[PDB]
Amino acid sequence: MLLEAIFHEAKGSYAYPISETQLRVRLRAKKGDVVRCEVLYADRYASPEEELAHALAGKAGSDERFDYFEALLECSTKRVKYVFLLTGPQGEAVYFGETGFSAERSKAGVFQYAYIHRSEVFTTPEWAKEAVIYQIFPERFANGDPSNDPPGTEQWAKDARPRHDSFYGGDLKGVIDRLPYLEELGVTALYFTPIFASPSHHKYDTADYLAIDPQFGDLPTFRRLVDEAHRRGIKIILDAVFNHAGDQFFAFRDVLQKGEQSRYKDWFFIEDFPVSKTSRTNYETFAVQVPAMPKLRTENPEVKEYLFDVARFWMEQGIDGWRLNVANEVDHAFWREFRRLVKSLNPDALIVGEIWHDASGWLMGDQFDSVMNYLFRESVIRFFATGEIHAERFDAELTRARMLYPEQAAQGLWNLLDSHDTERFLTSCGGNEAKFRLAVLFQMTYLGTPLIYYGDEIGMAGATDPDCRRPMIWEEKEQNRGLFEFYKELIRLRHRLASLTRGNVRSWHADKQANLYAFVRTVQDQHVGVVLNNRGEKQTVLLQVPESGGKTWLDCLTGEEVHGKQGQLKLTLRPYQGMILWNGR
C-alpha cells in the first residue's frame, strides 16, 4: 500500500461542512491500493475512554491514477477530530492521522476540524442548481429597434459571414420581443456579455459603468427587460468587468489631463507619468500593450467603493447575478467584500467567476458561487467531437474535475459547449448532427448547470470568432426545428427529474473498446441512468443494476425496458444513441 500516495487535509475540498453539523471528508489514494476506508471520529474534547464513532467512506470515483473515497461525519458538538482506517487488498490495515501512518491508532494521531460556523457553510442560490443559462450576445441576437443600429450596419441575413468589426444592429428591445421564444425553450436565466457604454465593438473597455450603451438601449428599456424577463420566470445575469476600465473611463480621462495633480492617479497603476497612452505605455494595462484597458487598483479603498456602488446601482434594477470577467486578477479581499455586499442586497444573487485554471482558492464559500467549467468543455470536445479520447479516459477526466472543488460548487459550475470565443460545437463535430446531439444529451444530464450559447438550439454553425457570432436565424423555415424540439425535451426532463439537478454522479460503466459510457444520478429514491453510445455502429451491452432503485426502468426519450434479469440489464443501442433510464421514483 503506497503511503506516499495517500492524501488528505482538514480544509479545502477534502474536509468541508455541508451544514453546521455535518462534515464531508474526502481522501485520495493510488488506484487499487485501498479496498475499504473507514473513519473513526468523535468530538474534539471527548475523553480517551469513549468509544469512537464510525463512518464508512464509499469509493466516490477514480481517475487516471487515483481513487477517491468520500465520507460524511455527523458532528452534533460542531467540533470534530478523526482518523482514517485504511484496509489493503492483502488484508493489511493502517491508521492515518495528522501525525502520520501507523498500525497503532494512537501513533497515527488525529486530524482536527476546529469548529463549524454557520456563516462558513458554503451556501449557493437554490435556483442556480436547476437553472438553464442562455448566453446572449446583444449585438447579434435580435435587432428589435433599427433606429438603434450604428452607422454602417449590415443586412441581417442567413448567408452572412461576419468580420471582426461588423455590425448587425442587435439590441435589448429585440431581446424583449423574443422572450416568448426563450420561455418556450425553457431557459431559466439569460446571460449578457458586457452591455455597458463603450466606444469599442466588444464593449470590454467600459466607458461609463452606470449607463447602457446607446447601441443596445437605455435605462428605461432595460428595466422593462428585467420585468418582462422576471414575469416569465427568467433571471438576468449581467457581465461585469472590474479588473480594468476602458481608455475613456472618466477617471482615466482626468489623469491623462491632470497628471500627478489628478485626485484619481492612485486609481490605476501608473509608473511615471505624464500618462503617455500614445503607443507605448507607462501604466499597467490588461494583457500587454492595450492602452484602451487600464487596470484598476481595486486595493485602493476609493476605487472599491466606486465599483461597489456600481454593483449596488444595477442590483436596484433587479439583476440576478454577475459574471466576473478576468476575476482571477483582483485581490481576494475585494471579492470577499463584494460577496458580502451582494448577498446582503439579494441572497439569491449569483456570483460566477472567469478563471481558466484551478479555481480552488476562489471556491471555498467566501468568494464565488461557481465559475465557468472550462474542464467540462475541453473534455467534451475531445470525446464526442474529435474522438481524441475514449470513454474510460473520459470518465477519469470528468472525475478529476469534480473532486477539485466542494460539492456545493461542483453542482453550480457553468457547463458550456461553446461561446463567442470558440466555434460552434456543431462545427467541432464536423456538421455531424448525430454527434452534436449526443453531446447535448450529456450536457443536459450531467453534474452542473447547462449553459446554452445563443443559436446552438437551431443548429447554427460557424468557425471561431467572428464566424461564431453570426446573426441569429429567425426564419422558421431556416431553423433546425428538429434540434429545437430536441433541446426543449431534454430541458424538460431536467426540470422534472430531481436527480438531474439535485442528485449526485457516480461512474456506472465505461468501455475503452466500445467507447460506451454510462453514469447514474441519485437523489433520495430517484435513480436516472444515462447510457451513451459514442460509436456509429449498433451495439448491445450488459450493465449492472445499482442496488437501490428497482427491477423496472424507463427510457424518458422512447419507452420501457424492464430488463432487471438477475442483476443485469440488456440494452441494444442504435448508433450514437443515448438513453435516459429512470427508475420511476
Ligand X SMILES: OC[C@H]1O[C@@H]2O[C@H]3[C@H](O)[C@@H](O)[C@@H](O[C@H]4[C@H](O)[C@@H](O)[C@@H](O[C@H]5[C@H](O)[C@@H](O)[C@@H](O[C@H]6[C@H](O)[C@@H](O)[C@@H](O[C@H]7[C@H](O)[C@@H](O)[C@@H](O[C@H]8[C@H](O)[C@@H](O)[C@@H](O[C@H]1[C@H](O)[C@H]2O)O[C@@H]8CO)O[C@@H]7CO)O[C@@H]6CO)O[C@@H]5CO)O[C@@H]4CO)O[C@@H]3CO
Q: Which is nearer to ligand X, 142 or 355 (CB)?
A: 355
- Please report how close the Cβ of residue 241 comes to ligand X at its closest, in angstroms: 7
Q: Which is nearer to ligand X, 55 or 238 (CB)?
A: 238
Q: Which is nearer to ligand X, 326 or 498 (CB)?
A: 326
Residue type for position 232: R
Nearest Cα to Cα of residue 7 among 135, 137, 117, 101: 101
* CB within 8 Å of 272: residues ≥ 6 apart: 282
Give the Cα separation of 210 and 311 in Å (integer). Answer: 9
- Please report how close the Cβ of residue 204 comes to ligand X at its closest, in angstroms: 4
Distances in whole angstroms, Cα of residue 223 to Cα of each of 172, 212, 226, 227, 229: 10, 11, 5, 6, 10
- Please report how close the Cβ of residue 416 comes to ligand X at its closest, in angstroms: 11
At residue 118, the 3 state secondary structure works out as helix
Within a 10 A sphere around the Cβ of 475, how many other Cβ atoms?
10
Helices (H) and strands (E) in the chain, counts: 15, 27
Kind of pairing between the strands at 350-353 and 321-324: parallel
DSSP secondary structure of 231-292: HTT-EEEEEE--SB--TT-HHHHHHHHHGGG-TTGGGB-BSSSS---SSS-SB-BSSSS-TT
Q: Which is nearer to ligand X, 78 or 202 (CB)?
A: 202
Within the chain, what is the greatest distance between any pair of CA atoms? 83
- Please report how close the Cβ of residue 200 comes to ligand X at its closest, in angstroms: 8
Q: Which is nearer to ligand X, 36 or 201 (CB)?
A: 201
Cell of 170: 442587435
- Which residue's Cβ has the minimum distance to ligand X? 202
Q: Which is nearer to ligand X, 293 or 410 (CB)?
A: 293
- Please report how close the Cβ of residue 483 comes to ligand X at its closest, in angstroms: 25
- Please report how close the Cβ of residue 349 comes to ligand X at its closest, in angstroms: 21
Strands (E), 156-200: 189-192, 196-197
Residues forming contacts to ligand X in the complex (CB under 6 A) are: 164, 202, 204, 286-288, 290, 325-326, 354, 356, 420-421
Cell of 566: 438477475
Q: Which is nearer to ligand X, 313 or 356 (CB)?
A: 356
Give the Cα separation of 430 and 424 in Å (integer). Answer: 10
Give the Cα separation of 361 and 369 in Å (integer). Answer: 12
Cell of 154: 449590415
Give the Cα separation of 488 and 297 in Å (integer). Answer: 45
At residue 16, the 3 state secondary structure works out as strand
| Residue 214 contacts residue 197 (beta carbons within 8 Å) | yes
- Please report how close the Cβ of residue 465 comes to ligand X at its closest, in angstroms: 6
Q: Which is nearer to ligand X, 35 or 290 (CB)?
A: 290
- Please report how close the Cβ of residue 296 comes to ligand X at its closest, in angstroms: 13
Q: Which is nearer to ligand X, 139 or 369 (CB)?
A: 139
- Please report how close the Cβ of residue 69 comes to ligand X at its closest, in angstroms: 34
Q: Which is nearer to ligand X, 51 or 421 (CB)?
A: 421
- DSSP 8-state secondary structure symbol assigned to residue 41: E
Q: Which is nearer to ligand X, 25 or 413 (CB)?
A: 413
Nearest Cα to Cα of residue 249 among 222, 285, 300, 279: 285
- Where are the alpha helices (H) located in 48-120, listed in sequence order? none
* CB within 8 Å of 309: residues ≥ 6 apart: none
Q: Which is nearer to ligand X, 166 or 408 (CB)?
A: 166
- Please report how close the Cβ of residue 164 comes to ligand X at its closest, in angstroms: 6
Containing 31, the helix (H) or strand (E) segment is none
- Please report how close the Cβ of residue 369 comes to ligand X at its closest, in angstroms: 18
State the Cα torsion 279-282-284-289 to the nearest 10°. 20
- Please report how close the Cβ of residue 135 comes to ligand X at its closest, in angstroms: 11
- Please report how close the Cβ of residue 217 comes to ligand X at its closest, in angstroms: 20
Q: Mind spelling out the 3-state secondary structure of 68-82?
A: EEEEEEECCCCCEEE
- Please report how close the Cβ of residue 386 comes to ligand X at its closest, in angstroms: 17
Q: Which is nearer to ligand X, 164 or 477 (CB)?
A: 164
Give the Cα separation of 319 and 322 in Å (integer). Answer: 8
Q: Which is nearer to ligand X, 104 or 421 (CB)?
A: 421
- Please report how close the Cβ of residue 294 comes to ligand X at its closest, in angstroms: 12
| Residue 176 contacts residue 216 (beta carbons within 8 Å) | no
Cell of 78: 460542531
Q: Which is nearer to ligand X, 293 or 490 (CB)?
A: 293
| Residue 285 contacts residue 294 (beta carbons within 8 Å) | yes
At residue 470, the 3 state secondary structure works out as coil
